[PDB]
Nucleic acid binder design. Structure first.
Lengths: 212, 100, 870, 90, 208, 443, 69
RNA sequence: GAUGUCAUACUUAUC
């Protein structure tokens, strides 16, 4: 709507404003981090989610000022003036080639469904309240220490391979609590002050509400 | 260590021999020399632990007491994936004080 | 000089008022010249007056004056002379420096400290004079040759380090050319020193770099001295490098197999010693490269007798564990008679070789315990258990190791019943060796084989050895503790017999006897709780509570250690010396100037603050937190690590509001090892309790107009961030304007402390979404990379290495961009080092963060694989 | 082998004022021959003393085994004599 | 061998990043491509100076510390200043008598107020972008205005009360703008009373 | 905002595939590595279908995977190398239904670099050592041993690094009760990067080097190093000892070379191409897999070219040396990443683009009417071997696992007028591409 | 000095653009050959299989930019 | 701004 998001193959995706009286297209927003994005998907009027060919996927959020009234020579650093910022970045391991914000099940909530090149299918759903997000972050920090991967690579160093993770909770490590030993699950439930059926219900309710 | 700039490590191929630390250097890290949050143990090479050099301190060189381990700031910064952190040469440290 | 007698006037002038009695100096402020040192510094007594009389030797006169000021002057003057000679070593040249250093170290009236300072100057002048000391290689080697054969281990290590530095600086051809006439010399000690220097050069420059030269020196047939020197160099290279000669074992064994067939017995003994040293390295796996060496050696054990037969027996005993089981059984089945026949040898070296081979001859299967107890152990007990063997350390330790191997092989009780009779002898060294052997037998095997007919005799022998000790060695107390730990519940009819001898040892005229009794009470404190003995521990604690008034501080520290062991073995609130009448009793005991006594007092105060904090009225702890600031600044590195834990326990008990003001008031003392030890204590107090209660007060100490207080507050914040780690995500926004203002200061130490705090915040909050404050701190840490101080450069490098993992390698590559191709080399080297550090931190992450480079005319640099899209 | 901080004279602080010369001499002569002993008789110098021994090794042994010794007034800290620290009141 | 700055400016696609010192490097084209990159950061200006970037603010006066609102809203700074003023007047005898019998309870304001100031009353600071580097004169260069708007200080200096009634609100150059016309450098500028309604455009200028 | 990434459909494109007795029974099992997920499949001979038994997320990029069996044992351990600098030896537990990590040996930093080992992983057929080689100038050899509690133990990793030497492939030569040998096609790039004329980079072909790990000296040294007339792509080890011609054949563009050193000469054989296919104006054809098999009588290799013509190669040799190499066009299969010939007449092909197949061997050998070729045939003018394409007659399709990797583009739409939405995605690469509609319902 | 000899691709202060470009191309080729996603994208972009793409990437490691200068 | 003598002060949980 009255704007364009030109995704470049090397640096980043740049926003361009279109005028109704004139016919010029002056770019007023760009990103500083190199991504080499393949595809992209719009979620809100300000933020834009994109995916890279290396395997990472980020979300570029616009500043709250968003000065688009620019009529037209130096920029800030060899580019535009309003540099955008990132609020979410996560490495999936495969090149995500399709992303779309929709609803896979009726009666649930909106979520970004992504299809990669390795045949897998992922889903990104936001957090409703801060308590559930804090409980999921505590469950992830407990599972990263109590349940190491078989490959020997760190779970914190896996999503932070190319770009560092920020506000991204890995659900595959949180969903591995029901496939471990009962003693380690009881210790993780006692560290979180809950029950292992209650922890399994809390881990399964978000997956049932967000997707199938 | 980080205090003496003339100290050099072995940097050889790390085998299966676990490093040991003395009572005077127990809890301290090998590289950062910190006593908070141990994360990963130190693996010594085969040349640094053979015969009479087994179960010795990596930093000082005396008789070992406890097990050696790296700090949490070294495991995340990929400092434990390097060679053997064993001090071989002792220069300008604990040598002039013995003669004085 | 320090033991010279002084008159009454010099003693009276060195005392203040208010006490009741119950030309020979060179050119000014140069230090005192010795009457025997007036030859090297003879050109300094006359004035310089450099005007139309100043050749290039005038700089050598200044270099000799600097060496004279570093040799016998002040240690700040020696440091200034070393800084002047290290930074100007290239301008002065290695020629006159070597010509002034070489006759100074070769003086017959030198000392240990002067020779150590000369070796340190030669080691510090070897890094700037690289590829320039090649004509001076032999002149330095002739001075460094007797340093490896010295008595002190530190001088030998310094000589080995100097020889390795000379081999690394002069290459391989120059050392081989210099050490070539030093092989056929007439002096045997100079030949052995040249062989040791060649072995050190081969260890420092690689084995195949000197392997064909050693092969040509070993296979040459002109004289026996060159072959003996080559065999000694091969033996020294095998004994120096433990596991480094294992890929080159076959190439050394093929050269060593040419020996031991000549007419000279010394060359055969040297070849047998080299084979034993090579088998020593390959102790478990030497047979593979040794099948050509087993045939002439064993016949040497059969056809002749003497020192060569002893060397062949030592080589056989070293090669026997490195073979198969049937081969080791066939070797031990034909060498036990030769070992039994050599038991009556009067020679000490053959007896030592037999005692070393007896430990390796019985260490696996094949040798039965009955035959070893019948025909091997009585001659080993009759021929080796003498009084002369306990005098030498190499003859006592090898005998103790052979006895431990015989006790592990045959049995512990059969060795204990033969070694318990020597515990009540009249010699201290033999009794100490018997106690060490009994402690090793109790630690390795145990006390389960000992019956009731020998345990009381062993306890009586241990009591007679502990009660009749004349030295200050801890071998007898450790042996008694090992016997009490191996006995367990079998020592129940022994506690009135032992402790009744302990308290009777507590009242004596000597001072070391009470300390030994307290150490024996501290070593036997863990054996009383496991044997249901609680009344005796309660009596001993009440006895030791009044034993804190001993005038000897060495006995008082041992009594404090015994009280700490009794408080650890028993309950904290269930002690007959209770904590209500012990914690005020230790408050004047904490003001002792001794190291071990104050360390034990601080450990007891930390234990009483951690386990018994409800036993005080919360006012004595505030008075002990002010005495804890005087517990630091001690050269022991142990009490300063327990005082911070005691301050953290006091802050956890009494609340983090009174100890924080005492820690902040002690931050301005302007003394080393006292403000960092208080910053670490403040960080431990912030990490034990909630850190937010220490958040504004640590922000208040930076408001005071002082550099030392601001540096201590920044160090405390950095240490608190490093101790917190993942809990620093909530305290980053409060410390961001403090770190942004500390990085803009003119002082480099505050900038280094802010860089260390930023490194701790980046290493603690990685993976939490805090890349906004880290990118703000990196913009201020980036102009600090151009500093000239090595400490500030190391702090900036640590901050960059911590921020590259936190903010991502792409931001570090963007900040290091446009600086690798910089015109100024001083910035280009730092940018290349930062790029190498970023590549070593994350190399795979730099592929997606690499900038786009256009293709040239002849070469192409554009990545066409990543530029394509489906 | 000895550090340069050690000397033949050793200072003692927080000494009891009721201590006699015989008890101080018996405390000092346990490690060797004591050459001289000076006790303070001033209100600004009360609780301190200076013991000079004839042997440097005996003085080092007395400094090692006299620090924070049991004393009525307090721990009998025995530090090494310094020229700049003894004349700090001037 | 080393070309001049004119050939380096003509050969590079972006001659604005070309400097005088880049012509004597070992790779002028590579340095010009690295200096004109998208996300590259420039070198600091203290690489060619001789004061080591820290010897310039010697005699300049600086404030000791700027405390945030969340730390100043707990009363710890005033209590610390009162404790410092009480400790600065005590002598050595009063400092040595307070070490054997200390008086507990110096401040002790609260325990939960610090948690409320560090968790509930937490304020985000004023950060910056990664490209904006730091210099010696960056802390004093704060001058880095709009046509048709006037600040409070400029209105206090010129003596022009800002009001919604556009009769007395414009500066007295409005009569010259009525007699001569609009400014030629700003065709889209509209002032109330000449080309804009007076009660509607109360901002005394509009860029449309 | 805080999101949460979950996996609805797991990854189905298989990158690596191995087979062996992982459970410890007489039946065999397949272990697949899809890059970030490790799965275990049970090839049931009763129904012919493939059933997954375990699926774990390794949270990394598995660069190599190979199963090895110890000397005198029934269960086979899995050796995995990932983007981290640590090799992991694990054992599948049928009771707990999980992959227990038996050992994890770290030898380098993380990330998919060229200095960190993990790219190439070879194992000895006897089960005495394991070689981990990187892309260039890095190699290590670990010695696996058996402790008396029936335990697997790993010794200190040896050093076999050679600077300025890149490695394309590595394999372990068969040696019965002898020293383990690792054969690799190394290539020196020092003279190609030190000469600015450009002609040194055209005479820098790879050479096969065999490093022999000496157990007596506890070190690894290069025993033999022989140059090759063509750039090799992959290597295939042949069983020997008491079996037959122990060696390592090298595949290349229209070339198969048997190059066992010592006494056997290098036997070269051109790859039989198609009869009249208009698909190669000037391009050759190389192998993609080896798929060695031994039915306790002889040994064969089910090689697969770039087109998909699966060929059964069998070597006719003498008592000690190799006489000639023979091959024939066995069947036609889609292009697969790795082939794992299982026992009792099974063949699992894991296609990187498209669905995976599991077929049953009906006519093994097929040396009855097929015009087979040989390396000893005096043929001139190029390859002179034109095989005719034919449908599947030796193998019959039994199971078809929908494992199409290439999701590519995907859209969520409700064009089928249903309540729950559906997903229209793409799959396949080239002729095997297909538009797939997926719903949350069951078949 | 020793850092460039131990770990290749680090560089020094006298490193040219050609050696840095060749090291970056070798690192990009190693990252393409290691990661399965980049190799799958390179095989989906062309008509060749994964083995042919790996053989083309392995043969391009020797002087990926060309002759030095 | 550099040099060479002197003093003061600071840093690395150095001993």
């Amino acid at each position: 709507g009255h704007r364009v998001i030109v995704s470049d193959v090397q640096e980043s995706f740049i926003w361009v404003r279109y005028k109704r009286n004139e016919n010029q297209l002056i770019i007023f927003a760009d990103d500083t981090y190199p991504r080499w994005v393949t595809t992209a998907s719009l979620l809100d009027y300000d933020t834009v989610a994109g995916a890279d060919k290396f395997g990472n996927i980020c979300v570029v959020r616009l500043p709250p000022n968003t000065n688009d009234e620019v009529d037209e020579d130096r920029g800030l650093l060899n580019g535009a003036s309003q540099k955008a910022e990132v609020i979410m970045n996560y490495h999936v391991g495969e090149t995500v080639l399709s992303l779309q914000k929709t609803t896979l099940i009726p009666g649930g909530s909106e979520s970004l469904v992504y299809t990669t090149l390795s045949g897998g299918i992922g889903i990104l759903v936001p957090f409703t309240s801060h308590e559930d997000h804090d409980f999921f972050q505590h469950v992830e920090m407990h599972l990263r220490s109590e349940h190491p991967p078989l490959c020997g690579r760190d779970h914190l160093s896996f999503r932070s391979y190319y770009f560092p993770v920020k506000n991204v909770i890995d659900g595959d490590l949180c969903e591995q609590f029901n496939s471990m030993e009962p003693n380690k699950q009881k210790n993780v439930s006692e560290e979180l002050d809950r029950t292992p059926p209650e922890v399994s219900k809390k881990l399964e309710d978000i997956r049932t509400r967000y997707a199938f | 260590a980080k205090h003496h700039p003339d100290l050099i490590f072995c940097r050889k191929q790390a085998g299966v021999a676990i490093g040991r630390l003395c009572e005077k250097c127990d809890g301290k890290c090998v590289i950062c020399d910190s006593y908070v949050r141990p994360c990963t143990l130190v693996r010594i090479c085969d040349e640094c632990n053979y015969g009479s050099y087994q179960g010795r301190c990596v930093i000082c060189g005396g008789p070992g007491v406890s097990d050696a381990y790296y700090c949490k700031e070294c495991t995340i910064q990929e400092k434990d994936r390097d060679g053997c952190p064993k001090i071989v040469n002792l220069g300008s440290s604990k040598t002039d004080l013995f003669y004085e | 000089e320090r033991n010279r007698p002084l008159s009454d006037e010099e003693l009276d002038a060195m005392f203040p008022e208010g006490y009741k009695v119950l030309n020979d100096q060179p050119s000014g402020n140069l230090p005192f010249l010795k009457p025997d040192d007036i030859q090297y510094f003879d050109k300094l007594l006359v004035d310089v007056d450099e005007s139309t009389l100043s050749p290039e030797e005038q700089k050598e006169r200044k270099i000799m004056k600097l060496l004279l000021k570093i040799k016998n002057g002040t240690p700040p003057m020696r440091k200034a002379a070393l800084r002047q000679i290290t930074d100007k070593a290239r301008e002065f040249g290695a020629g006159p420096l070597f010509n002034q250093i070489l006759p100074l170290l070769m003086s017959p009236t030198l000392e240990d400290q002067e020779r150590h300072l000369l070796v340190k100057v030669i080691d510090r002048i070897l890094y700037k004079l690289d590829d320039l000391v090649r004509p001076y290689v032999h002149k330095i080697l002739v001075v460094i040759e007797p340093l490896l054969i010295d008595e002190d281990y530190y001088a030998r290590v310094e000589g080995r380090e100097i020889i390795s530095n000379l081999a690394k600086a002069a290459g391989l051809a120059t050392m081989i050319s210099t050490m070539r006439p030093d092989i056929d010399n007439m002096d045997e000690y100079v030949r052995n020193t040249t062989a040791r220097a060649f072995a050190v050069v081969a260890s420092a420059l690689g084995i195949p770099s000197l392997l064909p030269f050693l092969k040509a020196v070993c296979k040459s047939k002109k004289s026996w001295q060159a072959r003996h020197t080559g065999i000694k160099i091969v033996q020294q290279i095998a004994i120096l490098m433990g596991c480094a000669i294992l890929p080159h074992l076959r190439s050394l064994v093929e050269i060593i197999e040419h020996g031991l067939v000549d007419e000279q017995q010394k060359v055969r003994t040297i070849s047998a010693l080299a084979i034993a040293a090579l088998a020593e390295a390959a102790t478990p796996y030497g047979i593979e490269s040794f099948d050509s060496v087993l045939k002439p050696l064993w016949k040497g054990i059969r056809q002749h007798r003497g020192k060569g037969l002893a060397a062949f027996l030592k080589a056989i005993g070293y090669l026997i564990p490195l073979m198969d089981a049937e081969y080791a059984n066939y070797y031990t089945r034909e060498v036990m008679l030769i070992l039994i026949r050599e038991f009556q040898s009067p020679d000490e070296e053959m007896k030592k070789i037999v005692l070393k081979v007896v430990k390796q001859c019985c260490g696996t299967d094949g040798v039965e315990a009955n035959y070893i107890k019948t025909e091997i152990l009585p001659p080993f007990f009759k021929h080796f258990w003498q009084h002369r063997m306990a005098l030498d350390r190499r003859n006592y330790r090898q005998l103790v190791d052979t006895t431990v191997e015989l006790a592990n092989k045959v049995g512990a009780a059969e060795i204990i019943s033969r070694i318990v009779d020597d515990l009540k002898d009249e010699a201290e060294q033999y009794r100490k060796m018997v106690m060490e052997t009994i402690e090793k037998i109790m630690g390795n095997l145990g006390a389960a084989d000992i019956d009731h007919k020998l345990e009381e005799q062993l306890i009586d022998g241990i009591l007679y050895a502990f009660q009749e000790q004349t030295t200050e060695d801890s071998v007898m107390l450790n042996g008694f503790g090992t016997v009490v730990n191996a006995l367990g519940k079998r020592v129940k009819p022994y506690l009135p017999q032992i402790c009744g001898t302990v308290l009777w040892r507590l009242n004596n005229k000597s001072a070391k006897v009470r300390q030994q009794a307290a150490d024996l009470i501290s070593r036997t404190a863990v054996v009383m709780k496991t044997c249901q003995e609680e009344k005796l521990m309660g009596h001993l604690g009440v006895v030791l509570y009044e034993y804190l008034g001993e005038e000897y501080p060495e006995v008082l520290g041992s009594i404090l250690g015994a009280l700490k062991a009794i408080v650890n073995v028993i309950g904290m609130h269930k002690m007959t010396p209770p904590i209500k009448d012990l914690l005020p009793r230790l408050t004047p005991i904490l003001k002792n100037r001794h190291e071990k006594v104050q360390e034990n007092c601080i450990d007891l105060v930390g234990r009483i603050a951690d386990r018994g904090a409800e036993y005080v009225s919360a006012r004595e702890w505030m008075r002990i937190c002010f005495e804890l600031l005087e517990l630091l600044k001690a050269h022991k590195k142990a009490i300063r690590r327990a005082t911070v834990n005691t301050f953290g326990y006091i802050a956890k008990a009494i609340g983090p509001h009174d100890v924080l003001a005492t820690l902040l008031n002690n931050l301005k003392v302007q003394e080393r090892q006292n403000r960092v030890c208080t910053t670490v204590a403040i960080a431990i107090v912030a990490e034990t309790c909630s850190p937010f209660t220490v958040l504004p007060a640590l922000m208040n100490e930076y408001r005071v107009p002082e550099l030392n207080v601001q540096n201590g507050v920044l160090k405390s914040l950095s240490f608190l961030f490093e101790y917190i780690g993942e809990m620093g995500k909530d305290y980053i926004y409060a410390v961001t304007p403090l770190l942004e203002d500390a990085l803009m200061d003119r002082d480099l130490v505050h900038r280094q402390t802010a860089s260390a705090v930023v490194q701790h915040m980046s290493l603690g909050v990685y993976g939490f979404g805090c890349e906004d404050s880290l990118n703000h701190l990196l913009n201020y840490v980036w102009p600090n990379v151009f500093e000239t101080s090595p400490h500030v450069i190391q702090a900036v490098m640590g901050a960059l290495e911590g921020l590259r993992v936190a903010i991502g390698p792409c931001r570090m590559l963007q900040y290091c961009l446009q600086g690798l191709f910089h015109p100024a080399r001083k910035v280009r080297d730092v940018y290349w080092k930062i790029y190498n550090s970023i590549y070593i931190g994350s190399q795979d992450a730099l592929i997606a963060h690499y900038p786009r480079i256009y293709n040239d005319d002849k070469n192409t640099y554009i990545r066409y694989e990543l530029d394509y899209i489906l | 082998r000895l550090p340069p901080e050690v000397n033949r004279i050793l200072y003692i602080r927080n000494l009891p004022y009721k201590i006699t010369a015989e008890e101080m001499y018996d405390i000092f002569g346990k490690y060797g021959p004591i050459r001289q002993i000076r006790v303070g008789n001033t209100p600004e110098t009360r609780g301190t003393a200076y013991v000079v021994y004839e042997d440097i090794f005996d003085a080092k042994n007395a400094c090692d085994h006299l620090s924070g010794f049991n004393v009525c007034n307090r721990y009998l800290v025995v530090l090494y004599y310094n020229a700049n620290r003894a004349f700090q009141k001037m | 061998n080393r070309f001049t700055v004119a050939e380096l400016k003509q050969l590079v696609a972006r001659p604005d990043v070309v400097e005088m010192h880049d012509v004597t490097a070992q790779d002028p084209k590579l340095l010009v491509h690295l200096k004109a990159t998208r996300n590259s950061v420039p070198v600091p200006r203290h690489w060619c100076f001789k004061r080591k970037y820290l010897q310039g603010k010697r005699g300049i006066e600086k404030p000791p510390f700027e405390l945030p609102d969340f730390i100043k809203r707990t009363g710890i700074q005033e209590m610390r200043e009162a404790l410092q003023e009480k400790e600065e007047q005590k002598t050595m005898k009063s400092k040595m008598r307070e070490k054997v019998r200390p008086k507990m309870g110096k401040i002790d304001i609260d325990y939960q107020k610090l948690h409320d100031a560090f968790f509930k009353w937490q304020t985000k600071p004023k950060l910056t972008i990664h490209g904006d580097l730091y210099y010696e004169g960056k802390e004093f260069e704060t001058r880095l205005k709009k046509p048709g708007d006037l600040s409070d200080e400029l209105r206090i200096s010129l003596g022009m009360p800002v009001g919604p009634n556009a009769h007395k609100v414009p500066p007295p150059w409005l009569i010259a703008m009525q007699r001569y016309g609009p400014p030629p450098s700003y065709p889209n500028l509209k002032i109330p009373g000449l080309n804009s309604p007076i009660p509607e455009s109360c901002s005394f200028g509009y860029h449309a | 905002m805080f999101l949460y990434n979950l996996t609805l459909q797991r990854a189905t494109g298989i990158s690596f595939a191995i087979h062996g007795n992982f459970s410890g029974t007489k039946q065999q099992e397949i272990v697949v590595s899809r890059g970030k997920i490790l799965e275990l499949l049970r090839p049931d001979p009763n129904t012919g279908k493939v059933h997954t038994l375990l699926t774990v997320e390794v949270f990394g990029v598995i660069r190599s995977l190979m199963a090895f069996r110890l000397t005198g044992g029934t269960k086979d351990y899995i050796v995995v190398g990932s983007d981290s600098g640590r090799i992991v030896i694990l054992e599948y537990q049928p009771s707990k239904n999980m992959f227990e990590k038996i050992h994890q040996e770290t030898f380098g930093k993380s990330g998919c670099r060229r200095i960190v080992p993990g790219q190439f992983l070879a194992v000895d057929p006897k089960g005495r050592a394991v070689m981990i080689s990187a892309i260039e100038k890095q190699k290590l050899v670990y010695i696996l041993n058996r402790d008396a509690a029936a335990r697997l133990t790993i010794s200190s990793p040896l050093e076999a690094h050679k600077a300025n030497t890149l490695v394309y492939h590595v394999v372990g030569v068969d040696v019965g009760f002898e020293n383990p040998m690792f054969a690799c096609l190394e290539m020196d790039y020092e003279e190609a990067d030190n000469d600015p004329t450009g002609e040194a980079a055209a005479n820098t072909q790879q050479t096969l080097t065999f490093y022999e790990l000496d157990l007596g000296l506890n070190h690894v040294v290069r025993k033999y190093s022989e140059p090759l007339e063509e750039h090799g792509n992959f290597l295939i080890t042949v069983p020997g000892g008491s079996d037959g011609p122990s060696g390592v054949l090298i595949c290349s563009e229209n070339y198969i070379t048997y190059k066992n050193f010592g006494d056997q000469p290098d036997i070269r054989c051109p790859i039989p191409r198609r009869r009249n296919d208009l698909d190669d104006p000037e391009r050759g054809m190389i192998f993609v897999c080896s798929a060695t098999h031994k039915t306790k009588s002889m040994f064969f290799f089910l090689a697969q070219t770039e087109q998909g013509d699966i060929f059964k190669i069998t070597l006719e040799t003498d008592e000690d040396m190799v006489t000639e190499i023979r091959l024939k066009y066995f069947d036609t299969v889609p292009v697969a990443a790795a082939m794992c010939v299982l026992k009792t007449g099974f063949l699992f092909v894991a296609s990187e683009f498209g669905n995976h197949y599991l077929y049953q061997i009906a006519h093994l050998g097929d040396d009855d009417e097929e015009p087979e070729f040989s390396s000893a045939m005096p043929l001139e003018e190029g390859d002179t071997f034109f095989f005719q394409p034919r449908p599947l007659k030796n193998l019959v399709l039994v199971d078809e696992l929908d494992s199409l990797s290439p999701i590519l583009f995907c859209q969520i739409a409700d064009l089928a007028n249903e309540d729950t939405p559906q997903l229209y995605v793409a799959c396949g690469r080239g002729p095997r591409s297909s538009l797939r509609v997926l719903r949350h319902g069951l078949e | 000095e020793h850092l460039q000899s131990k770990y290749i691709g680090t560089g020094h202060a006298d490193t040219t653009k050609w050696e840095w470009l060749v090291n970056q191309h070798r690192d990009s080729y190693c990252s393409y050959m290691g990661h399965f996603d980049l190799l799958n994208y390179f095989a989906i972009a062309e008509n060749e299989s994964k083995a042919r793409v790996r053989f083309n990437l392995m043969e391009k490691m020797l002087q990926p930019c060309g002759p030095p200068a």
